[PDB]
Structures are given as structure tokens and as C-alpha cells.
Amino acid sequence: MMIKSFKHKGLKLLFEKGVTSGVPAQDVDRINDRLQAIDTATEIGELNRQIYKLHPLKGDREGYWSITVRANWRITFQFINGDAYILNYED
């Protein structure tokens, strides 16, 4: 799933440059893992692991999906075709 844009600049920074200044210092590995999954999956069903609690959004943000990083924090992205857009780290 080739990752095409970031809404969250702290994510763009971890992803492209391996810089941790924009995300919680404790969640760096966890978040990098999840980004690695999103990047590696070829289908959306491949992200439907238990710990990810993958689920679609309504929407408003329709065609948007979220996966859980921990507690209330989710990574979200819009899904058009086989691509991921507007990655975000919220809630």
C-alpha cells in the first residue's frame, strides 16, 4: 500500500527521515511498526489484525480507515484504489 501523503507532519518526519521530534517519545517504535504494516500490506484486509482494530470511518471521512496505536490514539488514512493518503495521528 504505497503511502502518498501525510496530514500529520510528525508522521511524515518519522517515516521519511526517521526523526522522532513530532510524535510521543514512547510510541516511536509502535508507530513505526504500524506505518511499516500500512506500507507493506497489498490489500486492506491484511491490516485486519486484532491489535490494530481496523475499522472504516463514517464519514464525512468516508473511504477513510483507522488502526489503533494504543489507548485512544489511532492512525487514519484515506483509501482510494490501492493507495494511502492523508495519514493522521489523532485522539
Binding site: 517515516f15 521519511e16 526517521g18 491489535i51
Partner: protein, 92 residues
């Protein structure tokens, strides 16, 4: 562009088991592997092989293909500039 840091799937699985409350020993028992192999895996010291990928996906979900793709993606990153193809003639 490409992801700056690409993890060995074993270390990811290790961080995931911790967030779950599943110990290496318990996980080994479940997927039907020796605790010795699993600990080497969670350390990122043996590869996540196809036989493992089937077992692991049976426990942590997604497809065996996904877990294998993680290993490959990591393996090829780890191999960047390690192999001199200088060197090899590309058949035309």
C-alpha cells in the same frame, strides 16, 4: 519516498506480544515452535521463514504472505550496497 527505518518482523512481533501480555514462551507453545527458535526470532536473529509465516499468521492474523513480505522488505534493505553487481552482465 521509502520508509527510513524498516524493522525485522521478529522485533515487531516482540513489541506486539509485550503489548498483549503474551510471553515468548507462551507464544512458542501456541504456534507449535521451540521456545529457543521463537526467542531467536523475537531478537531478530533468525529469519521469519515461510513455515513460520503460516504458523505466525494463524496466531497474529493477516496473511502468511504479509509476514513474508515484511521479512523480504527488511532482507533487501539490509542488503543495500552489500552485493557487488559491477560485475554481472545483463543479458540483452
Amino acid at each position: 519516498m521509502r520508509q527510513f527505518k524498516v524493522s525485522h518482523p521478529g522485533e515487531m512481533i516482540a513489541r506486539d506480544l509485550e503489548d498483549m501480555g503474551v510471553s515468548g514462551r507462551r507464544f512458542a507453545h501456541n504456534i507449535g515452535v521451540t521456545p529457543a527458535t521463537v526467542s531467536r526470532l523475537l531478537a531478530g536473529k533468525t529469519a521469519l521463514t515461510p513455515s513460520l509465516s503460516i504458523r505466525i499468521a494463524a496466531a497474529l492474523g493477516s496473511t502468511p504472505e504479509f509476514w513474508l513480505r515484511l521479512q523480504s522488505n527488511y532482507d533487501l534493505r539490509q542488503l543495500e550496497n552489500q552485493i557487488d553487481t559491477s560485475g554481472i552482465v545483463l543479458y540483452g
